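Reading group handout, session on sequence-to-structure problems. Before we discuss, look at one worked example. The prompt was deliberately terse, the way you'd type it at a terminal:

> structure Bcl-2-like protein 1

The input record follows.
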Amino acid sequence: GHSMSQSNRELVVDFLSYKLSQKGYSWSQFSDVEENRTEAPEGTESEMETPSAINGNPSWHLADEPAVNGATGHSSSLDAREVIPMAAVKQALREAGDEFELRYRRAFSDLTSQLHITPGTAYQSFEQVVNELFRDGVNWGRIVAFFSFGGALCVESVDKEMQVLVSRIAAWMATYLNDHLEPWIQENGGWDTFVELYGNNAAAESRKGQER
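And the output record:
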């Protein structure tokens, strides 16, 4: 709870909704909130019945097939006018985040049963499987593999009826940064520097003057 704990949490749900647009997932369950109230305490354990279930999804192949983009400018929505690394990193993590997982589409199959997302201790098992490819997460464009890793299990939410795991999979992904994963991030200037580094498409306009 410093100053980037809740600011770096909104940008995680931004690219998440852009990737669930091609899949066909309804984000109305996250806005209403009915799985984190009186549905299941700490998490549901009636979802995991067999390991031969969470490893296949009929909506895990929609990215490069339905009109693929070769990065022409995703930061054309203009969201860096709000200032602060929260709403400004919305399009910054879209031209390098949504586009990143749009090229190779989805190479994840048995990834749902690899980390296992069902109980409340699914966070510790998630940090072990993602750490295998997080050995080179020192660059601003290499840390994107961490966000796209926890954004591929959002399709198995409506398939296994576990809408409680999709509302917390993007929550612990943002808290992990504020925990101890912010060495070179806080050294430069949070995630605000990432907006003027990768997504400089909206920064090349030099704004206009909506303040004065």
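Points for discussion. First: The chain has one domain: 1-212. Second: DSSP finds eight helices and no strands in the chain.
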